[PDB]
Structure 1
Amino acid sequence: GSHLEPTQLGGLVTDQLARLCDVARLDRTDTETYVQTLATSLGTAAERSLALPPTTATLLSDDHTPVEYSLAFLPGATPALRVLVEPGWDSGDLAENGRAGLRAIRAMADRWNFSTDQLDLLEDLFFPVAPAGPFALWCALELRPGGVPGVKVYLNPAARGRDRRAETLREALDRLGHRQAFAALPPADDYPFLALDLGEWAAPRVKVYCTHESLSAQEAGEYSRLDGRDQTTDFFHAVAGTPSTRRALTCHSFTDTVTGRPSGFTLHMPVRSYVEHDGRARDRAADVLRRYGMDNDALDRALAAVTPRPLDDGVGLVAYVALVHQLGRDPRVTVYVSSEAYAVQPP
């Protein structure tokens, strides 16, 4: 429950999260619970001096901060806050990184009374004796009102070597009962992440991410079919600033094991790689939030909550902008915000 100095990594990210919780309009009790949860999940990384180099050159963020924030915008509602964390970041190698990440997940499982049996079922696939990169375990915490967060664990299909990416992904989906989910995935250049929901479900819910090195708006609309192809194509042109093709990720969520069809689609566009500085990245994110009837004012307050620097002084604060489509749900736009605990990428 102790605060940390702003010269320490834990002190910087807990200050950012506490201010982001006010933008999300969480009360003081939930804010206090979640800032301590993020500090605890970092382990010894919380006390590390920011003058030192980052312990792990993690791909979680460009400056290798083991924390990334995101805000999900529903029309007419204040955004929902989430935080992505790498619990094993302050470790020597990937094997130690993975063990520490699994320990933090089990602490969350014991605290909020949910099972890790589905995670234990995939342990040989994603945590071998000598794992390959680029990561071992990330945890996404959905900071819901009430103090009980939604937990997602991110796993690396390349953990047993890049040649076994599809083999590992196909085997994990088979063990989780999603024997036909892989057939619904679009053509991809990589399977970078497998997200697994932890909590209160009698059946496993999974999200499969696909990397597209040269994705077009035409292909993005084609992959979006679950209903709104035009919204996906317009979102592509607005965020990409259209070069014809852009690097982007698609996410495919499966919540049942019956049909083999996905229930969710997400177009995940790295706007930071397209614009010159964060002034333009924020502008494109603001135009999307505004035209979709969302709370673009909260975006600016969230950006100021993370850092006081001028947006034109760098690029990468607005890391990603995502369009989330879910059956029986209104569309949602998610803006991913970098911590920039170590560096601001130059324009």
Structure 2
Amino acid sequence: GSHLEPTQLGGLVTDQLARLCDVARLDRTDTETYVQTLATSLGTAAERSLALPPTTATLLSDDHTPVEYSLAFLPGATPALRVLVEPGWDSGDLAENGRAGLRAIRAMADRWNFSTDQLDLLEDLFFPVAPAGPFALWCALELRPGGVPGVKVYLNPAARGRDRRAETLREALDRLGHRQAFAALPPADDYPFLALDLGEWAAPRVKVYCTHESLSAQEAGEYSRLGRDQTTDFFHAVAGTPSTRRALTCHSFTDTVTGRPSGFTLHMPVRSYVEHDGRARDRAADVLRRYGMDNDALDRALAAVTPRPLDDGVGLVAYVALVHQLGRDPRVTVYVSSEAYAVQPP
């Protein structure tokens, strides 16, 4: 059973996650495991009344819910379900938030027998005494069949101040053995996130995010070099095309030798391009359909999250991403908001 009520943050999010597990076709056992894993990872936030304001005005989601869901669609397969959580969200300040987040990661490492050595290597870079914003630690859980999830940790290159973003990112990549990766990164307006895979890997795997305030379809195609035409068509499809849009690229480095990324993702914040979620869902559905992906599952996933009409707001479909990975089929990922605190109006 569950100690959480539907008036509590944990009750709402576990209900949403359980329904999403059905869309992902996870069995009852795995579903129970992951609903409990989410509740535990939220800590005291799980029991917080939804009537109180969000403890932290987090960047994780627009309405400051410390959870966001995503579904990764591959051609002809049921989508894979992931959840992003901020374990330290119910804390008073950023330093306490980060401490609680690291504690959560350590508990996961103990439970699932993986090492935090690579993460520990970076602690002084990303968790200083008086950290800067906008966040401290997020955790992405890939909810795989079997009940043992994939785990990634997200860290803030601006933790030691905005002026040290590049210095911090470059020193982290160096410590991790990725001494040529920075040179592979496109021009950017921010380095909002560094992600580290945690698990059974003898060498670090990292993902570097770049914010582009005014990215063009042509530039997106350029940066996808690890392909160009699929990335440009995706840009137009999701952007609905003015000539430039705000977007993020992710650059995944899975070996330390070449300095070349093995993965590239274009993340399009569709919620910023459309009037309401009816339009955002339309564009995501069209992209999935064109790629031969499970577009019916998208509709079921949205309904699993909220029963509201899609046109009654915007931001439920937070992002659509095109994921390229050497040696794999392209993937489309749709990011879906919890809306535990607010529905942004059209």
**TM-score relative to the length of structure 2:** 1.00
Using the alignment, how far apart are the partners of 1:166 and 1:216 within structure 2? 23
Deviations 1:244-278 (A, max 9, x none): 10000000000000100000000000000000000
Using the alignment, how far apart are the partners of 2:68 and 2:144 within structure 1? 17
Deviations 1:9-59 (A, max 9, x none): 000000000000000000011000000000000000000000100000000
Q: CA deviation at 1:281?
A: 0.2
Using the alignment, how far apart are the partners of 1:2 and 1:242 within structure 2? 46
Q: CA deviation at 1:2?
A: 2.5
Q: Verify: 1:62 aligned to 2:79, yes or no.
A: no
Using the alignment, how far apart are the partners of 1:202 and 1:178 within structure 2? 14
Using the alignment, how far apart are the partners of 2:25 and 2:317 within structure 1? 21
Using the alignment, how far apart are the partners of 1:41 and 1:327 within structure 2? 32
Q: CA RMSD in A?
A: 0.5
Where has structure 1 moved over 3 Å in runs of 4 or more?
A: none
Deviations 1:266-312 (A, max 9, x none): 00000000000000000000000000000000000000000000000
Deviations 1:211-248 (A, max 9, x none): 0000000000000011x110000000000001110000
Query: Could you say what secondary structure the match of 1:40 adopts?
Result: helix
Superposed, 1:112-191 pairs within 5 Å as 112-191=112-191
For 1:334, the equivalent position in structure 2 comes to: 333
For 1:298, the equivalent position in structure 2 comes to: 297
Deviations 1:90-123 (A, max 9, x none): 0000000000000000000000000000111000
Using the alignment, how far apart are the partners of 1:235 and 1:97 within structure 2? 36
Deviations 1:153-202 (A, max 9, x none): 00000000000000000000000000000000000000000000000000
Q: Verify: 1:281 aligned to 2:276, yes or no.
A: no
Q: CA deviation at 1:4?
A: 1.0
Using the alignment, how far apart are the partners of 1:272 and 1:3 within structure 2? 34
For 1:249, the equivalent position in structure 2 comes to: 248
Q: CA deviation at 1:3?
A: 3.8
Using the alignment, how far apart are the partners of 2:134 and 2:152 within structure 1? 19
For 1:72, the equivalent position in structure 2 comes to: 72
Using the alignment, how far apart are the partners of 1:83 and 1:98 within structure 2? 19
For 2:262, the equivalent position in structure 1 comes to: 263
Using the alignment, how far apart are the partners of 1:4 and 1:124 within structure 2? 36
Query: Could you say what secondary structure the match of 1:173 adopts?
Result: helix
Query: Could you say what secondary structure the match of 2:265 adopts?
Result: strand
Structure 2, gaps ≥5 residues long: none
Number of equivalent positions:
346
Structure 1, gaps ≥5 residues long: none
Using the alignment, how far apart are the partners of 2:258 and 2:345 within structure 1? 47
Using the alignment, how far apart are the partners of 1:12 and 1:63 within structure 2? 14
Query: Could you say what secondary structure the match of 2:29 adopts?
Result: helix
Query: Could you say what secondary structure the match of 2:340 adopts?
Result: coil
Using the alignment, how far apart are the partners of 1:240 and 1:233 within structure 2? 10
Query: Could you say what secondary structure the match of 1:210 adopts?
Result: strand
Using the alignment, how far apart are the partners of 2:147 and 2:55 within structure 1? 30
For 2:214, the equivalent position in structure 1 comes to: 214
Using the alignment, how far apart are the partners of 2:173 and 2:329 within structure 1? 27
Using the alignment, how far apart are the partners of 1:57 and 1:112 within structure 2? 31
Q: CA deviation at 1:135?
A: 0.1
Using the alignment, how far apart are the partners of 1:104 and 1:161 within structure 2? 24
Using the alignment, how far apart are the partners of 2:286 and 2:3 within structure 1? 37
Using the alignment, how far apart are the partners of 2:262 and 2:3 within structure 1? 41
Q: CA deviation at 1:81?
A: 0.0
Query: Could you say what secondary structure the match of 1:34 adopts?
Result: helix
Query: Could you say what secondary structure the match of 1:280 adopts?
Result: helix
Using the alignment, how far apart are the partners of 2:225 and 2:287 within structure 1? 20
Q: Verify: 1:105 aligned to 2:112, yes or no.
A: no
Using the alignment, how far apart are the partners of 2:36 and 2:3 within structure 1? 9
Query: Could you say what secondary structure the match of 1:42 adopts?
Result: helix
Using the alignment, how far apart are the partners of 2:219 and 2:44 within structure 1? 44
Q: CA deviation at 1:325?
A: 0.2
Query: Could you say what secondary structure the match of 1:107 adopts?
Result: helix
Query: Could you say what secondary structure the match of 2:293 adopts?
Result: coil
Using the alignment, how far apart are the partners of 1:311 and 1:317 within structure 2? 8
Query: Could you say what secondary structure the match of 2:327 adopts?
Result: coil
Q: CA deviation at 1:69?
A: 0.1
Using the alignment, how far apart are the partners of 1:278 and 1:3 within structure 2? 33
